[PDB]
């Protein structure tokens, strides 16, 4: 049972809450290593924990790979967003992170560490602002500011370190030394003035992808991404990813999951407790599948429960009840279907003669209360009210599962096998436009009028 309950604090095999906040993950050999950090009683760095697992569900605690006692400089400081990377040349692992003095956020510098073994305790080197000796000054201190950070290993074996500089206004991609333990130079300045934070750098099909959040502290915001053929130039504009709050989380890292059937990408996010005035140690996690519709189109869906298989390399929503259904309209006699049976996102929903097609079959996922999600079978997209409309004539379409109320539906029995499927957003129910009795009849949203065109039959397949 490789199921994951989003919006909660995962537990280790010991039954204790996992504390690897704002962390990344590394795949070395036959093991996945999850690294992260957690505060003490004074909201300061006390230790970086390490968990390993082969199924990505059952994590084994391996103690602190880094601690406040690991170095006299770490006794009292703020460390966040620790990422690790492996080096084929050296044969050792190098850890990077964001370092602060612990009394304010003026230092804005990066830190380095390394170890012979992943689960082994790293040895702290030094904290510094990227390229201090270049005689460059960034807001009074020497060297570029380094806040939110993340690591990336290219195909050619080159190491890279990206962080937020110029008061979090710009992004800096630094080319690392062959040993990954130092910064050789900077590759390019990305998205200046955009003020993008919590950067995540990944690569697929010769394309470079950069997932970033917004700069609004604990407040969950809109996550975005961009692609490019090279790192120096050719970067596309920022495109939205997920909803307006990234499903109440902030992107921390993205990792390719190798399997037998193929490869899928795991999005890791942090649900910072600071959103509700909670301690950093209370923060939760949000893992989601990053789908690549195309080379220039990504989708980050939200599933309250996500099933994953490492050996298979598959990441998708977990549906406890896979019973397929067909919604038949009382009036028209037609069944709920997707226009042209398209699997494309934002596809129009129309009625059609029962032809036993996949596009006419639907799943039913309970989402708490008397409400459920109506997910199409052919395309994993769910029934959705376009632009979260609250008015009559609101066109219905199939959209990426975003946990929005415009995607939750309540079934109400009115006798026989017919129901009145109302929306959780405004209460208005599913309605065939103009009582249409022909094929291609636009399925919409409308007030309860007691008309047969608003009555649907639930049929098994």
391 binds ligand GAL, rule: CB under 6 A: no
Site string for ligand GAL, 288-327 (x = CB under 6 A): ----------------------------------------
Least distance to ligand GAL, CB of residue 246, Å = 13
Please tell me whether 387 is known to bind a ligand. yes
Stretch that binds ligand GAL, among 70-78, 233-241, 350-358, 383-391 (CB under 6 A): 383-391
Considering only 360, 361, 406, 423, the residue that binds ligand GAL (CB under 6 A) is: 406
Stretch that binds ligand GAL, among 75-83, 226-234, 268-276, 382-390 (CB under 6 A): 382-390
Please tell me whether 384 is known to bind a ligand. yes
Considering only 203, 307, 386, 433, the residue that binds ligand GAL (CB under 6 A) is: 386
Stretch that binds ligand GAL, among 115-123, 177-185, 295-303, 396-404 (CB under 6 A): 396-404
Identify any residues that bridge with 436 across adjacent strands, giving them in sequence order. none
384 binds ligand GAL, rule: CB under 6 A: yes
Euclidean distance between CA atoms 154 and 152, whole angstroms = 6
402 binds ligand GAL, rule: CB under 6 A: yes
Which of residues 257 and 374 has its CB atom nearest to ligand GAL in the complex?
A: 374
Which of residues 170 and 384 has its CB atom nearest to ligand GAL in the complex?
A: 384
Stretch that binds ligand GAL, among 103-111, 135-143, 184-192, 401-409 (CB under 6 A): 401-409
Euclidean distance between CA atoms 387 and 402, whole angstroms = 12
Least distance to ligand GAL, CB of residue 399, Å = 4
Which of residues 101 and 243 has its CB atom nearest to ligand GAL in the complex?
A: 243
By CB under 6 A, the residues from 344 to 363 that bind ligand GAL are 346
Which of residues 213 and 402 has its CB atom nearest to ligand GAL in the complex?
A: 402
Stretch that binds ligand GAL, among 86-94, 201-209, 211-219, 385-393 (CB under 6 A): 385-393
- Structure token digits, residue 381: 């997209």
Residue 359: partners with Cβ closer than 8 Å, 6 or more residues away: 337, 338, 341, 342, 376, 377, 378, 379
Least distance to ligand GAL, CB of residue 387, Å = 5
Euclidean distance between CA atoms 96 and 119, whole angstroms = 15
387 binds ligand GAL, rule: CB under 6 A: yes
Which of residues 103 and 293 has its CB atom nearest to ligand GAL in the complex?
A: 293
Considering only 203, 388, 395, 433, the residue that binds ligand GAL (CB under 6 A) is: 388
Which of residues 299 and 388 has its CB atom nearest to ligand GAL in the complex?
A: 388
Euclidean distance between CA atoms 127 and 148, whole angstroms = 14
Considering only 24, 403, 404, 441, the residue that binds ligand GAL (CB under 6 A) is: 404
- Structure token digits, residue 411: 């079934």
Give the count of residues interacting with ligand GAL (CB under 6 A): 9
Annotated binding residues for beta-D-galactose, written as ranges, equal: 384, 387, 402, 406
**Contacts with ligand GAL, residue ranges (CB under 6 A):** 346, 384, 386-388, 399, 402, 404, 406
Annotated binding residues, written as ranges, equal: 384, 387, 402, 406
């Amino acid at each position: 049972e490789g199921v994951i309950v989003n919006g909660t604090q995962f537990k280790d095999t010991s039954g204790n809450v996992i504390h690897a906040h704002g962390g990344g993950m590394l795949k070395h050999g036959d093991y996945y290593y999850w690294y992260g950090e957690y505060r003490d009683d004074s909201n300061l760095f006390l230790g970086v924990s390490c968990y390993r697992s082969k199924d990505l569900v059952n994590w084994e605690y391996r103690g602190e790979v880094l601690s406040r006692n690991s170095a006299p400089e770490l006794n009292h400081c703020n460390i966040e967003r620790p990422k690790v990377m492996y080096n084929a040349s050296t044969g050792e692992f190098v850890m990077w992170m964001h370092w602060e003095n612990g009394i304010n956020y003026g230092q804005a510098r990066a830190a380095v560490a390394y170890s012979k073994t992943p689960d082994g305790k790293f040895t702290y080197i030094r904290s510094f602002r990227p390229m201090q000796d270049t005689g460059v000054m960034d807001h009074g201190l020497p060297g570029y500011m380094s806040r939110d950070c993340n690591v990336f290993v290219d195909t050619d074996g080159k190491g890279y370190f990206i962080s937020a500089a110029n008061e979090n206004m710009d992004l800096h991609l630094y080319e690392l030394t062959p040993d990954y333990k130092n910064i050789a130079s900077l590759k390019a300045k990305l998205f200046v003035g955009q003020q993008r934070e919590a950067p995540c750098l990944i690569k697929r099909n010769g394309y470079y992808y950069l997932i970033t959040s917004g700069c609004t502290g604990w407040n969950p915001n809109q996550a975005k991404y961009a692609y490019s053929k090279d790192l120096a130039s050719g970067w596309s504009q920022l495109y939205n990813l997920g909803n307006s709050t990234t499903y109440r989380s902030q992107p921390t890292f993205i990792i390719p999951v190798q399997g037998s059937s193929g490869t899928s990408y795991l999005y890791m996010g942090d649900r910072w407790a600071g959103a509700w005035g909670g301690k950093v140690n209370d923060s939760q996690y949000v893992w989601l599948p990053l789908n690549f519709i195309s080379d220039t189109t990504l989708e980050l869906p939200y599933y309250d429960s996500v099933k994953i298989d490492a050996s298979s390399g598959i990441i998708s929503e977990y549906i406890p009840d896979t019973t397929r259904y067909k919604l038949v309209n009382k009036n028209s006699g037609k069944v709920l279907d997707v226009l042209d049976g398209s699997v494309d996102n934002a596809a129009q929903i129309v009625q059609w003669t029962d032809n036993g097609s996949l596009s006419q079959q639907w799943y039913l996922v309970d989402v708490g209360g008397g409400y459920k999600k109506i997910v199409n079978v052919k395309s994993g997209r769910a029934l959705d009210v376009k632009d979260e409309s609250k008015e009559d004539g609101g066109v219905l379409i199939q959209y990426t599962s975003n946990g929005g109320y415009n995607q939750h539906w309540k079934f109400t029995d009115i006798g026989d096998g017919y129901y009145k499927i109302s929306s959780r957003h405004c209460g208005k129910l599913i309605d065939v436009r103009k009582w249409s009795t022909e094929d291609g009849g636009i399925i919409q949203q409308w007030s309860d009028a007691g008309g047969t065109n608003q009555h649907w039959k639930l049929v098994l397949v």
